[PDB]
Amino acid sequence: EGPIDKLKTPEDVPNDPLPLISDFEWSTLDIDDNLQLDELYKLLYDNYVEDIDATFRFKYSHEFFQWALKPPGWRKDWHVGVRVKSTGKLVAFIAATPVTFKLNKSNKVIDSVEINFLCIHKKLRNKRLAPVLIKEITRRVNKQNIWQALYTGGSILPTPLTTCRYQHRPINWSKLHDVGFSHLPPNQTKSSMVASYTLPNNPKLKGLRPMTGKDVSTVLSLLYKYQERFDIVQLFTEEEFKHWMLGHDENSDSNVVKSYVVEDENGIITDYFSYYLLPFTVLDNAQHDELGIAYLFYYASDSFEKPNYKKRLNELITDALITSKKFGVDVFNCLTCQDNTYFLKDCKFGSGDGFLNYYLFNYRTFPMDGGIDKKTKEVVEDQTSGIGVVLL
Template sequence: MPPKKTKKGKGKGKGKGKGKGKGKGKGRGRGRGKPQAKGRGRGRGKPQVSQKKKTKEKKSLIPLTKNKQIYPEEKISEEEKSKRHKFWKDQPVVQMDENVNEKKIGAIDQEKTVEEIKKKPFSLPSHYEWCVVDLMDDNKLHELYLLLRDSYVEDDDNMFRFDYSESFLRWAMTPPGYHPEWHIGLRLKKTGKLLAFIAGMPISLWINGKVHHISEINFLCIYQKLRKKDLAPLLIQEATRRINKKNIFQAIYTAGRLLPKPFASTTYYHRSLNPKKLVHVGFSYTTKLMTIPRLVKKNALPSKVKNTRLRPLQESDVESGTALINNYLKNFKVSMYFSEEEFAWWFLPREKVINTYVITDPESGNVTDLVSFYTLNSSVLDHPKYKTLNAAYSFYNVATTVELKELVNDVLILAKNENYDVYNCLNIMDNQDFLDDLKFGQGDGLLHYYLFNYRILPILPKELGFTIL
């Protein structure tokens, strides 16, 4: 099963809009994601121009007819394309030249039994060995944190790299019903050093009105010096084998690069909360007309929220909150389905991991509106002053008694007051409704969604209700 992210992050691609600005794309990944790839992008409400010498921008999105997918224009050599896609030609995924129609929807491979699955792990070169990374062991968790910190998603200019906190990693990979053996590591036999990792997590996914119990693949990471050793296919195959042993044969994953073949392609948008810092670290930039003082003024937010009844989610809200979000998400062609236990895990606030705010009905006490974001900071590489970019990522939002735009504006204020530098979101679900009005700028980060061993018709970002971390 495929990876969520690559070195490029959730992907790098150029976007168009009204203003110029450097955007960031987180690539799930996850990943339920978010990579951050810095580069030139365009976005309404973010008129910022590089202090560096500008290069000619190219069109990055090819709009096709209704119900067709929107894919980025990747100018790579045929040799590179062939090498990139070689592994996937033998995998149960939709191929690039394949057109999916109604008759083809469903599993790609014939159904197997658990008894038919390979019993022994895939063979490795003699100096490597498989291991399970126990995320309940603080030492093993820290070891994984170091691998991801030093070798995971990084932008092409080597200025930013994801810095998942240890508490975030434990939250992201140990949800209710998780399988420890799906946290797969590869070690050097001689020293025991952790050199590579891939994770699988069980999830329930709405696909065209039916709930499917599948896996999510995320956090594929290989030590930088081993990137050309073709270890990724081995990690993916071993993850597939272990997941199949649990009688699960489908998976969802994301990547920033274009692989065979996305069922949806989404774009990252960014709302500046600390314009001055973003300019200093090279995430945003200025022009003669749009100076830092003007940027600060343009992106200023009130100090207090408009909805005084907006408060953090509590355990007493779990039942009605679960009902609210499932009732909302079932309207999308592909979306997450939450049990009450899963909702509590993913949404109850955890410091510097997940923030969820709700409005409740005064009479019934039921949750009527919900807004949430998770924390995924990036290391700022080789900067004399700043070491960390504090980033919030939109998770799930549901508005039934107030406007969605009003709800998100309030959470921007809350994030700003908690010292976040930027608020990121994808143009999925109903997010497009508030992006322009709330001064989000279109970045250059693209995130493609893929299904393993399952065909569906391509969908638009607004028809997608699933966030990979």
């Protein structure tokens, strides 16, 4: 005779209404399961980032996902998907990947994460699902005692570190024209343009060779020395840098990241550069269905201290442009970050219509130079940008 439940008081009961029924459920993806990797691939292929005119869409491949989402220390529960209960169809996704960065001006090192691949099926937008995905990944990261994050995005977000502008260097101008990526300037002809962008078919620098596992430690020292010039920079353990520069070195030969080094007579490494391949799907075109694209990644030179710096940097990027032809690259991209403004003009990079904002979650710092004029958004030559990190 009496109550069946244990005593409680108003403090013991939740203060927020219970959640109502949902047609969706959380689903932790396991990308080592090919079928699940296929689902993720499909979701982004049909629903990911497009340019302002809906002409092109980013196309991340299977190999690219395995490289980007599986760096040493990666966590499966940080690959968050959302599924329709009735059919089990994947309709949303977001990911966190470990990263360590340093703010050189205050000499502060932060073990953080990078948030990327936020995507919701086109037919499920404007239902405010995004805020939930963001809060859930935040929950899962905070659970591992990490409270800061680094990510990029469009203008739609408050207080960015800075804003950088995309730059484009045509390799196969004709194809770019054919798909509407570039237009013909007035009083100019298709042949005059092709002739102005033409490059040799073999690299010019002596000592240039593909980077190998033996070069990691030396290339890292070179990058660290070079990186001091920027405000925010990425740090790596030797295995992390190996992963990012060479990929999961199975039989080697990563098809997504390409690394090169320049060693002199004495066998000393004086320069290096890297870039990753991330094509564009051409939405509506009856002659081409894909645009080959390379993005400048991390690079360094020991001549930053000498007066031939700008010249050497231009030669270095020129050889990078030349090597990309071997991989079907139609246009080579980069941002106005790092010391890129030092070579943009002479290597014939043109400004694009896209911008990229950088954000730090839960961490305030002084704003940085984005390589462009704060007012006119135009590129400012030979300007060291505060941004020294590149995201995928």
